[PDB]
Amino acid sequence: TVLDSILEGVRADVAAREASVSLSEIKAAAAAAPPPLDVMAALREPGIGVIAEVKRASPSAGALATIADPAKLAQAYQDGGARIVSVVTEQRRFQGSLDDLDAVRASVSIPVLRKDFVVQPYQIHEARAHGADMLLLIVAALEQSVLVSMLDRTESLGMTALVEVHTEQEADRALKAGAKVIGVNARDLMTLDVDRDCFARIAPGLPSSVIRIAESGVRGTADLLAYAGAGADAVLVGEGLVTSGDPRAAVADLVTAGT
């Protein structure tokens, strides 16, 4: 129910933003934004893609990094060979913001994933207006009807949905919703326990055409390689990178893992 408390805060925060920037305005801004980058093409490039994340804090970790300059962090990520930059935009528990998404979008050429708790259409157009190419949808957070709607709207704007699951049953739901990219989060968003075997148990079940992403818990090359050996097409890493004194070198180490 960490997840439930997060969603309560998110719904209130979204409503307050919408009161200042209307749904019509954000839809217009999204329509006017330059088209999203082809995330699927990025994910199909050779090698295990590293999705490097901008995250200042989390429920499980508390404060991780000040990240006064998220653009400069993202530039390091791209310099290190990251495939995609993930930007956490949730304010109350992760100390992120849409400002971070703008800063990162303006600083890198690689695709940008908005990492937040998407529960209503407003957030989807908002992500697009602020330059997101990829958008997280969390199966644990969304009733199937809502998941399918959110996925449809995401794709309608040309963005790719990263549909996040923690169980086989959630993976089955993701497939039925039309997921083309499925992320397995090793962290249980309810209880905050990290189980890195999740990906290995779930990944084999997926149609080969679905892109598989392993999220969370990567401390170094060994963890990345373990995910790759279980079939990950990409791996998403936050804590180990944001706490680095040399994010460029840390990313490059992961990017070149197994060489």
Ligand X SMILES: O=P(O)(O)OC[C@@H](O)[C@@H](O)c1c[nH]c2ccccc12
Note if 216 is an active site residue. yes
Note if 8 is an active site residue. no
Which one of 126, 170, 188, 215 is in contact with ligand X (CB under 6 A)? 215
Which one of 21, 47, 60, 221 is in contact with ligand BE2 (CB under 6 A)? 60
**CB 168 → ligand X: shortest distance, Å?**
18
Note if 149 is an active site residue. no
**CB 12 → ligand BE2: shortest distance, Å?**
17
Note if 215 is an active site residue. yes
Does residue 187 touch ligand BE2 according to CB under 6 A? yes
Q: Which does 237 bind (CB under 5 to 8 A by kind): ligand BE2, ligand X, none?
A: ligand X
**CB 94 → ligand X: shortest distance, Å?**
6
Residue 234, phi then psi, degrees to nearest 5: -155, 160
Does residue 53 touch ligand X according to CB under 6 A? yes
Long-range contacts of 19-23 (CB under 8 A, 24+ apart): 23/121, 23/122, 23/125
CA distance 50 to 213: 10
Does residue 91 touch ligand BE2 according to CB under 6 A? no
Candidate ranges 55-63, 76-84, 102-110, 202-210; the one touching ligand BE2 (CB under 6 A)? 55-63
Chain residues that interact with ligand BE2, rule: CB under 6 A: 2, 58-60, 187, 189, 192
